[PDB]
Design a protein around this ligand. Structure first.
Ligand code: F6C
Ligand code: CLA
Ligand code: CLA
Ligand code: CLA
Ligand code: CLA
Ligand code: CLA
Ligand code: CLA
Ligand code: CLA
Ligand SMILES: CC1=C(/C=C/C(C)=C/C=C/C(C)=C/C=C/C=C(C)/C=C/C=C(C)/C=C/C2=C(C)CCCC2(C)C)C(C)(C)CCC1
Ligand SMILES: CC1=C(/C=C/C(C)=C/C=C/C(C)=C/C=C/C=C(C)/C=C/C=C(C)/C=C/C2=C(C)CCCC2(C)C)C(C)(C)CCC1
Ligand SMILES: CC1=C(C/C=C(\C)CCC[C@H](C)CCC[C@H](C)CCCC(C)C)C(=O)c2ccccc2C1=O
Ligand SMILES: [Ca+2]
Ligand SMILES: [Ca+2]
Lengths: 727, 80, 98, 41, 172, 31, 116
């Protein structure tokens, strides 16, 4: 047999080309490897986590290096509103002179890409000013990643390999990660904000050569000890402060203003310093809750085991199953990555980033598609847990036993919400389509979104005139009668009641229909994933499904036919629904913001209530300069996005070959090619691995990969080129 | 190779043996059902995994189960 | 060690390949009472001889699909077919009926 | 400046050699090394 | 005091498990990284014909030997003269080295050779144990290093068009 | 101004250190 | 095999390639194309032989294979064919390069213009 792969002896004896593909797709599934003891599993995961950490630090070190080497960071910080950030230089020797002239842009003297990731706005706020600042930051992460590569190699050495009881210590980890990873790092980040980022915002250079001399405050460190902490809430910043200069600047380092800095249109650095200081000491307090070595502290299994009439065994279910933990942590990370996307556009934290419209569109779509991917992997690894790690006797009559007995009620209730939302949202859209087409656009059914308009009034919008409970001046939620200490509010209400920002935008009847279509996409994608997880151990069509694994093709054409019956194929089906849902989300965010940024917010309001308006005025109207990136009239700077646009349409179409055509068509075609090669003269090659068609599961995965790459490269090219050419 | 398991709910109807195109299955005497015979899978290294035997099994649920295992040249059905 | 006339056949592109000489081969032998036409599992029609026949095939499934045709498409039925597995060193193993 | 690939940054000869090395000089040796690794018995 | 010496594990071992041999097993001569690299160099790559060993060794060597006289040699003030003197330097070194390979084989393989090419020699570092392997390596090194030198000569003589290729100036 | 030629060459020489340490982590993780 | 193949592989990039507007540039890009294809193909011949001939090979290079169309049945035949194809196709490419670089004097030879 072959030596590759070393982790699967049955794949080594595979004589076909299936050996090479299945060795890739199972290379990081350590539990199914040959002779993997359960303690050796944790040590290889721990060293793989150090390898992933070093890749992350090398990635940001390369972003900092290429901006310092080929970008325009020192030229961009002069006027960030009239300049354009440069990502890196272009070296493509197939370029012609019109392509060289088109990408010699943003005041550069060579072909460059325009940065759309926002790292210029992020480094400028935290105090980077020179390319020498970005270089030593790139060198420091170049050595920090090599420390991560050392610790992965070190904790695989026999003296430094941790035992299993160290890995299962869920109290010493949860204390150290709350207080050290979440608390001390948020404390040290406040220490960077008040020592470095706040003086560089006020014209004072603070580096490693002069930070031991310059205090963060004129009253240096004495108001903290004497308990007069209000001496850090000094003159905060004037309304005429210019970022990076000393004119109009204050001395305060911890303030409670709220709202936005008026020039940069972003959050105050003093509100962000008092944020991470309040977050730090709360997380350091929270990291002193559980007992490890000293008697004091709670014990996590006692709160779970003494919780019934239902959480008995839930500790040991969590602590012993890595797939339960992975599915739990992907769900928490998936909610947060949505929250990062929803809050970074509404409350922009980086200086002048709210006026870089292509960056705000790129950053929202990035973190929403990341969040949708972590959400479907939370359910996927929660389904691998129910097949591999779930013990029905260790979890008898607890909550995990309840839903597996309740599974026909959960799926049927998810199906009704899915069918109700789909019948009535598509019914309202097609009705409005037929009314506008037949010349009667006022016969449209335009349901006003009264629940989220009143929710906007309860947050501070007086735009609807309903004047009640924080849309109210003399409310008890506004005045804060026992305190009168809501310092946030007078700065907050200028963020809500201005028309140029992007928190609590005005919603109308076209906003209600798309929020219900988003709710349709959330409920169906959950319905595919929950039904795939709850039927993963078995159904009445296939009662012994847990002995077939997470991923298998089918159970054959008998019993009616069993195509796409495994829990893996419910992940495969929900990925189409996740992309379609996140398609509907980012279409709505982009079309609403393209209407707000152009001042044509009215034109969104008549056209978003029927589906031709999305087709004509969003898809067709914004494609005009994208597909003119090259033409017989010439080429311009949108040519790489026009080429990627067709590239994405091509990968999406290659996907349909793998998803519509199935295996035995291709397997019988390969036999005729194997006939033709054996009987052709002068063709001295011969396949060592026997050519077979791709397997049933593999081409569902290959077809989903081409679908996803075709989905993202199409919209990502359309999002960049339509936003950056209009603005 | 694949794994063909015969469970004790088998009524000995010989229909999986008739359905198998690879002659994997045969009947052995059992005295565990009325027909006195049960299915067995001696030549399971010739099994291609077509699951024609499970399509032929009248017992609910099936007395014969095929588990797709390591792919060999015989189990992949390759004439080349 | 294996007796029989090869059936009358012009050859085809569906027959034995490199695998038949380097890994394993199969042969089906049967007796017929008359000269008649059967369908090859490799595609096409061949003529079996009156008396003992012998046909080399690439897979065990091709020999058992031929034996299924011999039992079901001819009156009188041909039930006496034997299937062998031939290895490249000439080692012949009798595999059907077992 | 407008007729060919230039670089107004430090060491502009580095993309002149690295992009040929990374993309069409080294991959076929790396593909051959990986091929011998996955075919060896 | 010495009784527990040679009981704990050491990364330095006797060579081939034999402490009487005059070598040590170190990371430089016996680790898996240096054994994968050295034994797959064309001098040691298993199964190669003696000619193809020489051709890969030659093509690598004649290519870089053009280099030094082009940049620091006496013809370096003009581009065409520097490339010619670098080519002739690589040609002269190759003929001299391949003459040395041939007369090594004519002197060593006379009956049973002495030293490392004797029939009883377990020299893993010197595996070319016949004279026809040495003469085929000599012809391989000659043809490879001549070809590698004239390849470097052709690239350096056409450096103006090759620089225009690698900057896209040929697309005007 | 942007980086100098001695700054780029420093970064290339320093990056050989995580190149070597990733090689010894990859070969330790396994074949 | 090499001398026949490297000779014609110079051809396509000379006439239809991106350097075709000038004669000296088109001949150089055609030579480099034939050099790059030859090194890549001869690397493929060598790694085929290193992968196939490990013990008794599978398929058409097995000891029991009656493949008349694949008669090079040992690895030393494959490594000598690899070196032969490399040296022949390099020589055939530089022969076509020398004829095309000197096309003005070669056209004058074939029309008798050198007899003036
Ligand atoms: C190696 C060896 C070998 C040989 C020899 O030696 C051969 C040959 C033949 C002949 C006979 C014929 C004709 C030709 C043509 O025209 O087509 C094109 C192709 C090409 C061009 C291919 C070729 C290739 C060459 C020869 C080699 C080269 C190599 C390189 C250069 C190296 C590089 C290396 C590095 C590392 C990368 C054929 C064919 C077919 N194929 Mg077949 N091959 C083979 C390979 C392969 C693979 C891998 C696969 C998968 C992809 C396939 C596939 C296929 C399909 C689909 C088909 C068809 O359709 C065809 C036919 O059948 O008809 C009828 N196939 N192919
Ligand atoms: C024949 C098709 C082709 C090929 C092989 C290349 C190859 C390359 N392109 Mg090019 N590109 C192409 C078409 C192509 N391009 C077209 C049609 C355009 C529009 C004019 C561009 C515009 C373009 C830009 C804007 C950039 C590239 C860059 C690159 C380099 C790395 C990027 C990459 O390919 O990702 C592989 C994964 C690589 C040299 C990048 C670069 O130069 O980085 C070194 C880069 O920034 N290309
Ligand atoms: C106080 C001591 C301490 C600290 C600082 C850490 C830190 C870490 N350990 Mg832990 N560990 C500890 C003690 C500690 N450990 C102890 C005592 C034990 C034994 C009980 C363990 C057992 C252990 C195991 C088994 C593992 C770890 C792992 C980790 C890493 C988590 C992965 C990561 O990088 O996320 C970093 C997370 C943050 C920085 C916080 C993120 C918070 C949210 C998600 C984002 C909020 C930030 C903000 C909003 C975003 C702004 C950024 C943007 C501007 C760019 C992290 C470096 C894992 C690892 O990767 O090992 C290499 C791992 O597998 N630890
Ligand atoms: C931190 C996040 C994280 C981690 C540690 C893992 C880890 C794992 N996943 Mg999971 N997964 C994740 C996020 C994560 N995933 C997300 C975000 C999704 C939704 C896209 C999934 C959806 C998913 C499925 C459907 C499956 C896994 C599987 C696996 C396991 C094996 C992976 C493998 O061998 O392929 C290695 C992959 C490559 C070498 C390249 C793949 C490139 C793709 C095809 C493009 C491994 C435990 C598999 C498993 O556990 O089998 C029982 C499995 O079937 N994952
Ligand atoms: C019937 C609904 C229901 C309710 C009201 C609760 C209530 C609670 N859960 Mg539970 N949970 C439930 C079902 C429920 N659970 C089910 C069915 C599962 C399995 C998916 C869980 C999984 C779960 C975990 C893993 C944990 C809780 C925890 C808790 C406690 C959180 C207290 C806090 O805020 O910190 C709280 C008593 C936490 C806890 O144990 O605190 C005592 C905790 O760690 N829950
Ligand atoms: C235009 C494309 C399109 C449309 C309209 C549908 C419609 C539907 N899908 Mg489907 N789906 C699609 C493409 C589509 N799908 C694709 C490409 C895939 C990947 C293969 C899927 C995979 C998929 C899965 C895995 C599931 C669905 C389900 C559903 C139903 C959701 C409930 C609902 O909204 O009822 C309202 C009905 C409509 C909106 C369409 C009816 C037609 C109207 C009334 C005119 C007559 C609905 C019938 C789910 C389901 O059946 O839940 C009960 C379900 O679990 N779909
Ligand atoms: C579930 C969504 C939905 C709802 C709430 C309605 C409701 C209505 N439609 Mg609409 N319609 C729908 C789907 C829907 N339709 C679809 C899917 C189509 C395309 C076939 C139409 C095409 C349509 C036409 C052509 C007309 C209506 C009309 C009407 C009104 C007639 C009320 C009556 O007395 O009978 C009522 C407001 C009538 C009307 O008066 O317009 C407002 C009318 O002429 N509908
Ligand atoms: C992982 C982060 C990262 C990424 C995605 C890139 C991406 C790029 N680099 Mg850069 N590079 C990086 C880090 C990175 N670099 C670092 C830290 C250095 C200092 C040593 C360099 C030094 C460098 C030079 C000198 C050049 C590039 C060039 C390029 C471009 C073409 C590809 C190439 O030739 O790379 C070449 C790569 C190197 C010379 C070293 C890469 C070192 C990183 C850390 C390896 C990452 C491995 C990865 C994590 C494994 C997966 C491409 C935009 C070329 C360019 O800019 O053309 C316009 C170019 O000439 N890079
Ligand atoms: C860094 C490093 C290293 C090193 C490396 C080196 C040292 C390199 C070298 C390199 C080289 C040293 C290269 C070479 C090359 C060569 C070639 C590739 C050649 C080619 C040739 C040819 C192509 C030719 C051809 C011809 C002929 C033959 C004849 C006719 C004419 C002609 C010209 C056509 C190591 C691995 C240790 C480690 C890691 C790191
Ligand atoms: C029509 C026809 C045909 C075809 C043919 C063809 C296809 C042709 C081809 C042709 C060709 C394809 C040719 C080739 C040629 C080549 C040559 C003849 C070469 C030569 C070479 C040389 C001469 C070289 C030399 C050298 C070396 C080696 C090294 C050093 C340098 C030099 C350069 C000196 C046939 C028969 C089928 C049939 C009939 C008709
Ligand atoms: C095109 C296609 C093939 C043929 C594709 C094959 C055999 C893979 C071809 C891979 C070659 C080597 C190119 C690989 C290129 C990649 C970018 C790497 C299948 O085998 C198949 C199987 C099951 C369902 C659908 C399909 C299917 O659609
Ligand atoms: Ca001189
Ligand atoms: Ca040209």
């Amino acid at each position: 047999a072959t030596k590759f792969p070393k982790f699967s002896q049955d794949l080594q004896r595979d004589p076909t080309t299936r050996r090479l593909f299945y060795a890739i797709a199972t290379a990081h599934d350590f539990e199914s490897h040959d002779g993997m003891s359960e303690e050796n599993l944790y040590q290889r995961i721990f060293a793989s986590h150090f390898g992933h950490l070093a890749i992350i630090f090398l990635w940001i070190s390369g972003i900092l290096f290429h901006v310092a080497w080929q970008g325009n960071f020192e030229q961009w910080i002069q006027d960030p509103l009239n300049n354009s950030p440069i990502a890196h230089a272009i070296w493509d020797a197939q370029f012609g002179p019109p392509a060289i002239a088109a990408y010699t842009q943003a005041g550069a003297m060579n072909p460059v890409d325009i940065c759309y990731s926002g790292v210029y706005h992020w480094w400028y706020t935290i105090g980077m000013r020179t390319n020498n600042d970005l270089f030593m930051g790139s060198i420091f992460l170049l050595l920090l990643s090599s420390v991560m590569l050392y610790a992965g190699w070190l904790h695989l050495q026999p003296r430094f390999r941790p035992g299993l009881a160290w890995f299962k210590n869920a109290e010493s980890r949860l204390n150290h990660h709350l207080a050290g990873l979440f608390g001390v790092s948020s404390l040290a980040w406040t220490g960077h904000l008040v020592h470095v980022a706040l003086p560089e915002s006020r014209g004072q250079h603070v580096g490693w050569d002069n930070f031991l001399s310059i205090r963060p405050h004129p009253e240096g460190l004495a108001p903290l000890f004497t308990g007069n902490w209000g001496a850090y809430a000094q003159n905060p910043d004037t309304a005429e402060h210019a970022f990076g200069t000393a004119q109009g600047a204050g001395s305060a380092i911890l303030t409670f203003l709220g709202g936005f800095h008026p020039q940069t249109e972003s959050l105050w650095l003093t509100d962000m310093a008092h944020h991470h200081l309040a977050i730090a000491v709360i997380f350091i307090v929270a990291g002193h809750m559980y007992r490890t070595n000293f008697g004091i502290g709670h014990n996590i299994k006692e709160m779970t085991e003494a919780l019934q009439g239902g959480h008995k065994g839930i500790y040991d279910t969590y602590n012993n199953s890595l797939h339960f933990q992975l599915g739990w942590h992907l769900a928490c990370l998936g909610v947060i990555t949505s929250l990062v996307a929803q809050h970074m556009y509404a409350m922009p934290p980086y200086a002048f980033m709210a006026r870089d419209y292509t960056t705000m569109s790129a950053l929202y779509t990035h973190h929403q598609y990341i969040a949708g991917f972590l959400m479907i992997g939370a359910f996927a690894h929660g389904a691998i847990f129910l097949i591999r790690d779930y013990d029905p006797e260790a979890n008898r009559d607890n909550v995990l036993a309840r839903m597996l007995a309740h599974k026909e009620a959960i799926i049927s209730h998810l199906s009704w919400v899915s069918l109700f939302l789909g019948f009535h949202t598509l019914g309202l859209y097609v009705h409005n389509d037929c009314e506008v087409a037949l010349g009667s656009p006022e016969k449209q059914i335009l349901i006003e979104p009264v629940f989220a308009q009143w929710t906007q009034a309860f947050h501070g919008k007086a735009l609807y005139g309903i004047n009640s409970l924080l849309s109210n001046p003399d409310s008890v939620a506004s005045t804060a009668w026992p305190n009168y200490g809501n310092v946030w509010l007078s700065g907050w209400l200028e963020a809500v009641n201005n028309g140029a920002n992007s928190l609590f935008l005005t919603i109308g009847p076209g906003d209600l229909l798309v929020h219900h279509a988003i709710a349709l996409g959330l409920h169906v994608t959950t319905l595919i994933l929950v039904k795939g997880a709850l039927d993963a151990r078995g159904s009445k069509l296939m009662p012994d499904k847990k002995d077939f694994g997470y991923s298998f093709p089918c159970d054959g054409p008998g019993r009616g036919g069993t195509c796409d019956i495994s829990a893996w194929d419910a992940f495969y089906l929900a990925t189409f629904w996740m992309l379609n849902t996140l398609g509907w989300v980012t279409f709505y965010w982009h079309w609403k913001h393209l209407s707000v940024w152009s001042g044509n917010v009215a034109q969104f309001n008549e056209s978003s209530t029927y589906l031709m308006g999305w087709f004509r005025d969003y898809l067709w109207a914004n494609s005009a300069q994208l597909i003119n990136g090259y033409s017989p009239a010439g080429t311009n700077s949108l040519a790489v996005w026009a080429w990627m646009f067709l590239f994405g349409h091509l990968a999406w179409a290659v996907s349909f070959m793998f998803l519509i055509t199935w295996r035995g068509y291709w397997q019988e075609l390969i036999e005729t090619l194997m006939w033709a090669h054996e009987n052709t003269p002068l063709s001295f090659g011969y396949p060592k691995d026997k050519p077979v068609a791709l397997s049933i599961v593999q081409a569902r995965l290959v077809g989903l990969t081409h679908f996803t790459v075709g989905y993202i490269a199409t919209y990502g090219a359309f999002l960049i080129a339509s936003t950056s050419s209009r603005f | 190779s694949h794994s063909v398991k015969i469970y004790d709910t088998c009524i000995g109807c010989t229909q999986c043996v008739r359905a198998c195109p690879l002659d994997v299955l045969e009947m052995v005497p059992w005295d565990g059902c009325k027909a006195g015979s049960i299915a067995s899978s001696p030549r399971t290294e010739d099994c291609v995994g077509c699951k024609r035997c499970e399509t032929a099994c009248p017992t609910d649920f099936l007395s014969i189960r095929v588990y797709l295992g390591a792919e060999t040249t015989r189990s992949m059905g390759l004439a080349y | 060690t294996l007796t029989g006339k090869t059936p009358v056949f012009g050859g085809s592109t569906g027959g034995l390949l490199t695998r038949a000489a380097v890994e394993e081969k199969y042969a089906i032998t049967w007796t017929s009472t008359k000269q008649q036409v059967f369908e090859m599992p490799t595609g096409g029609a061949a003529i079996m001889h009156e008396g003992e026949n012998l046909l080399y095939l690439a897979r065990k499934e091709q020999c058992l699909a031929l034996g299924t045709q011999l039992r079901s498409k001819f009156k009188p039925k041909i039930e006496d077919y034997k299937i062998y597995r031939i290895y490249p060193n000439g080692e012949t193993q009798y595999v059907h009926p077992a | 400046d407008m007729t060919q690939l230039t670089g107004a940054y430090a060491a502009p000869w580095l993309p002149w050699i690295m992009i040929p090395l990374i993309f069409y000089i080294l991959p076929f040796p790396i593909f051959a090394i990986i091929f011998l690794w996955i075919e060896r018995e | 005091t010495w009784v527990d010496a040679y009981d704990q594990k050491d990364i330095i071992q006797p060579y081939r498990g034999n402490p009487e041999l005059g070598n040590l097993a170190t990371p430089v001569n016996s680790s898996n990284l240096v054994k994968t690299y050295i034994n797959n160099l064309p001098a040691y790559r298993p199964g190669l014909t003696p000619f193809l060993r020489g051709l890969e060794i030659g093509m690598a060597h004649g290519y870089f030997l053009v280099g030094p006289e082009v940049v620091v040699g006496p013809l370096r003030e003009t581009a065409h003269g520097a490339n010619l003197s670098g080519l002739i330097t690589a040609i002269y070194i190759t003929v001299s080295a391949c003459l040395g390979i041939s007369i090594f084989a004519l002197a060593t393989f006379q009956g049973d050779p002495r030293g490392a090419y004797n029939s009883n020699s377990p020299d893993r570092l010197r595996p070319l144990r016949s004279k026809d392997g040495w003469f085929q390596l000599s012809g391989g090194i000659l043809l490879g290093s001549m070809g590698g030198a004239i390849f470097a000569y052709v690239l350096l003589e056409n450096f103006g068009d090759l620089d225009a290729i690698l900057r896209g100036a040929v697309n005007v | 101004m942007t980086l100098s030629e001695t700054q780029v060459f420093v970064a290339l020489v320093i990056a050989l250190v995580p190149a070597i340490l990733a090689f010894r982590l990859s070969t330790e993780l396994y074949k």
